[PDB]
């Protein structure tokens, strides 16, 4: 019953492991092994569900075990020791073959294979922990093991591609346990989590390994948002060591999401609007990106309202993301009219929902924007309008108070008008036809460069498959 | 079939509490007469919410009667030897019984049997449409959408010119009922000529609706040719009140007497838009558009006007004008700004080189988006 | 004015009629709008050809 299932399950894994193993040890084609390693994990995660998941335990018994046996034991001990065939050497299905691990010769140190098997074994272990939620003890111990094991080795480029997945897991398990409920011991370890991924940024930069660099940068920036030091992020982000050379389009989308948040609060929407839209396109569009898709829509609503733009009514209506975008919808209307009263009621009533995603922080600041946006629209409609008429409409106290919020606004050229107080109206500053003006030359200049960039891109890339095909044997 | 559109529109006046109390109860007497006549017991339960068990006994009875009638018939017919032809004609009579009682679901089932045994392609199209009609009866437009799709698959498979005329009108009603009034304007003006009376909302109704879709969509120029000088509309004259109200409105627009336009607008809102079910939901869309389109035409003919002068002509106050116009400016058809102090409404419209610059720069930006998306994709793959 | 038989504008504030005839509009750009229009169909077709890569 139980043994047969685990064995078959183990066998399935053994097949996959062997493919990727051969692949790394036969010439250099790094990119292909890496893609294989990504699929292997998912296949194994879907697998576990069925044919039992103590197939890992089986493989541990039947490999060369330096400290993986004791780690595995540690794992069962957390979830109460269940032994049933868990003693090393009680399976030998290698059988000392030169086709599937030579048991004697590795021990002797004429051939070495514990390298890669170790790196893979920790990866399997982490996958199992997160799926189950075997957190607590195992997390600290894991972090402890992997760091001297991976630094024991003279780091390749190959090896670096595997460990950039391990680094993510260390970070995740520590965080998740933390938000469940605070502990003192959890903050002691926080200091240590920051210091290790940060030191490693330099190591990864010498090796110029693209996967590792990308990963570390995302984690460090997340860390800064958690603790609220915007300042630290500024120094870090001036230098851009973020590769965009070969990394997963998914990492690119994650990077841009950080940038948006930070810039927005530093009062820039020029960059923010570009990066959250850019991220949507970069991000896949599967049923595994529902999280990501939803939250991008949420941050972008805020960015536009902050600048003074009114987002499409159509954007929230025709979405299937309307259910969630219920607070955002209400904001949009309040702002539009310049009605102050509605805005107070909206922001108080939806405090909790906005506070989850920390968009609440942005919403206090939309108090300025309620009054200002109603006046953008009123100047548009009425060209010359007495301060008296403005005051009555939007409830604003007196002609002197309205003049002050407007005077500031036009410096920044939001409203684009000029005040005449010695007559008593405010007169919109027209630009009318801009073709007549010299505006189009600047528009063109940029676009030409974008076209030019795609041509060069086409050309380098086109050659890439061709070089491969020629060299291979053909009939 | 035929009674269903009549029943539903009367039911809809009763639902509304907007219309005059007189009309609401005048409609009560009339819907009641047809409720009894057709035995609407399953369907009465839908209608009684939205504004005798005998109707039900009468029902159930009508059930075993009309229900049994067709049953044993259907069986003698399945026993008798011609399978293709005889069974299917009988299943058409089966679908008629459910269609009398206003149950759209069981009507679909038996009419499906009718199709199943092979019948004339043309005949299949008649049958699909019958089901489609019952979708208007409930006011389930989603139901109509899918039914009408299956007809257009078979319309050119058959070559039927005969069923193409019906489809035009039903599809007119579909487009009319939905928010897109563009397709409606086209489909329905050509359904005037090719009107087929058979199971459809009267000829008088169609003519009114064509005018409505005409006004929303079509340019001043394009109204003149296609609606005003439209030979049919002139053949049909103005007899029904609704036709008169909408027609008169059209005329004073072209002739640009704006003393008589705004009184007609009030009339069309009361008597045409609100009582028609389709145009109850679109009342808002249509009246906002009409206000913007008339005001746009008058601004085009004036570099400058007074607020008092524009208002006085309409027969609305200076205060009233000032609010109603400031709704319409940011949606941008009016293309004007108002100097409050001088009271002038100056009009600024581009017609120069700027027109040809905007169109170019926007279209060419839409093209670049596509090049990037597609290029970058193919490199990866 | 609306018929476009002499298309002008009437300023009431001065009680004057200015009449305008043949307003200038870029002809170069008129030819370019049809050219961009073709390019847009073409990129949809090309991708469809390139659906074989997937």
């Amino acid at each position: 019953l139980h043994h047969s299932e685990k064995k078959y399950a183990e066998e399935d894994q053994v097949q996959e492991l062997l493919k990727v193993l051969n692949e790394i040890s036969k010439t250099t084609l790094t990119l292909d092994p890496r893609y294989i390693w990504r699929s292997l994990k998912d296949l194994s995660s879907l697998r576990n569900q069925e044919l039992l998941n103590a197939e890992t335990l089986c493989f541990t018994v039947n490999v060369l075990y330096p400290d993986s046996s004791s780690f595995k034991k540690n794992l069962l001990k957390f979830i109460t020791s269940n032994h049933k065939s868990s003693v090393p050497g009680s399976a030998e299905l290698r059988n000392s073959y030169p086709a599937s691990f030579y048991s004697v010769n590795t021990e002797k140190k004429t051939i070495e294979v514990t390298a890669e098997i170790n790196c893979f074994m920790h990866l399997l272990v982490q996958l199992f922990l997160w799926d189950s939620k075997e957190l607590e003890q195992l997390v600290e111990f894991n972090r402890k093991v992997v760091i001297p094991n991976l630094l024991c080795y003279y780091n390749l480029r190959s090896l670096n591609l595997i460990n950039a997945k391990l680094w993510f897991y260390i970070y995740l398990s520590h965080e998740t346990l933390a938000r469940s409920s605070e502990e003192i011991n959890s903050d002691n370890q926080n200091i240590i989590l920051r210091s290790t991924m940060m030191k490693f940024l330099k190591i990864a930069s010498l090796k110029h390994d693209n996967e590792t660099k990308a990963m570390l940068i995302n984690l460090i920036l997340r860390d800064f948002l958690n603790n609220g030091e915007v300042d630290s992020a500024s120094d870090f982000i001036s230098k851009l060591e973020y590769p965009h050379t070969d990394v997963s389009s998914s990492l690119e989308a994650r990077y841009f999401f950080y940038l948006s948040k930070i810039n927005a609060i530093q009062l820039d929407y020029s960059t923010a609007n570009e990066y959250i839209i850019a991220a949507i396109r970069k991000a896949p569009h599967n049923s595994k990106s529902l999280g990501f898709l939803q939250q991008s829509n949420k941050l972008h609503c805020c960015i536009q309202l902050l600048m003074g733009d009114i987002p499409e009514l159509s954007f929230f209506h025709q979405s299937n993301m309307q259910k969630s975008l219920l607070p955002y919808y209400h904001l949009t209307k309040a702002v539009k009219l310049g009605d102050l009263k509605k805005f107070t009621s909206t922001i108080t009533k939806y405090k909790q929902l906005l506070l989850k995603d920390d968009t609440y922080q942005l919403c206090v600041r939309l108090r300025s924007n309620v009054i200002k946006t109603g006046i953008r629209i009123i100047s548009l409609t009425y060209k010359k309008i007495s301060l008296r008429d403005i005051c009555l409409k939007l409830n604003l106290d007196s002609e002197q108070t309205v003049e002050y919020m407007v005077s500031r606004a036009i410096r920044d050229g939001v409203i684009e008008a000029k005040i005449n107080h010695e007559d008593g109206f405010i007169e919109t500053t027209e630009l009318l036809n801009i073709y007549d003006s010299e505006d189009p030359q600047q528009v063109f200049d940029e676009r030409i460069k974008f076209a030019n960039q795609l041509h060069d891109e086409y050309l380098v890339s086109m050659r890439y498959p061709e070089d491969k095909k020629t060299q291979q044997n053909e009939k | 079939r035929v009674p269903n559109y009549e029943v539903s529109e009367k039911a809809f006046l009763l639902t509304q509490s907007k219309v005059s109390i007189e009309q609401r109860k005048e409609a009560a007497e009339f819907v009641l007469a047809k409720i009894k006549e057709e035995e609407m017991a399953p369907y009465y339960k839908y209608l009684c919410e939205e504004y005798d068990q005998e109707l039900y006994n009468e029902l159930c009875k009508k059930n075993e009667s009309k229900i049994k009638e067709l049953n044993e018939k259907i069986q003698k017919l399945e026993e008798d030897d011609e399978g293709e032809l005889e069974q299917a004609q009988a299943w058409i009579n089966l679908g008629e019984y459910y269609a009398q009682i206003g149950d759209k679901d069981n009507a679909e089932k038996t009419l499906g049997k009718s199709l199943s045994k092979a019948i004339s392609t043309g005949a299949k199209i008649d049958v699909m449409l019958t089901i489609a009609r019952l979708g208007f009866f409930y006011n389930d437009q989603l139901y109509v959408k899918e039914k009408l799709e299956a007809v257009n698959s078979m319309i050119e498979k058959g070559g039927d010119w005969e069923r193409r005329n019906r489809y035009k009108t039903y599809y007119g009603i579909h487009c009319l009922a939905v928010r897109n009034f563009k397709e409606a304007a086209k489909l329905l003006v050509d359904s005037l000529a090719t009107f087929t009376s058979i199971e459809l909302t009267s000829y008088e109704s169609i003519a009114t609706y064509a005018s409505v879709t005409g006004l929303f969509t079509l340019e001043r120029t394009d109204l003149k040719s296609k609606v005003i000088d439209s030979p049919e509309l002139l053949s049909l004259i103005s007899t029904t009140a609704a036709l008169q109200s909408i027609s008169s409105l059209t005329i004073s627009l072209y002739a640009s007497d704006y003393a008589s336009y705004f009184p007609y607008l009030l009339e069309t809102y009361a008597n045409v838009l609100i009582p028609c079910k389709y145009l109850n939901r679109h009342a808002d869309f249509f009246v906002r558009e009409m206000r913007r389109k008339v005001y746009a035409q008058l601004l085009e003919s004036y570099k400058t006007l007074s607020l008092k002068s524009m208002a006085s002509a309409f027969g609305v106050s200076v205060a009233f004008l000032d609010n109603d116009l400031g709704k319409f400016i940011p949606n941008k058809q009016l293309n004007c700004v108002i100097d409050r102090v001088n009271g002038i409404v100056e009009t600024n419209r581009p017609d120069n080189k700027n027109a040809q610059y905007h169109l170019l720069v926007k279209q060419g930006d839409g093209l670049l988006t596509k090049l990037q998306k597609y290029g970058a994709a193919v490199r990866l793959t | 004015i609306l018929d476009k038989i002499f298309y002008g504008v009437l300023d009431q504030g001065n009680g004057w009629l200015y009449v305008y005839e043949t307003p200038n509009q870029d002809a170069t750009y008129d030819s370019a709008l049809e050219l961009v229009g073709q390019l847009n169909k073409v990129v949809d077709q090309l991708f469809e050809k390139a659906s074989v890569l997937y």
Binding site: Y458, P465, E466, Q472, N473, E474, K475 | G375, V378 | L53
Partner: peptide, 27 residues
């Protein structure tokens, strides 16, 4: 031109695999 040369490559993969396949059949 990207597409056209690219389509050729995809086919080139197939002709290459065949070479190996055809060698097996004579052996």
């Amino acid at each position: 031109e990207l597409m056209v040369i690219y389509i050729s490559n995809l086919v080139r993969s197939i002709i290459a695999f065949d070479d190996l396949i055809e060698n097996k059949i004579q052996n």
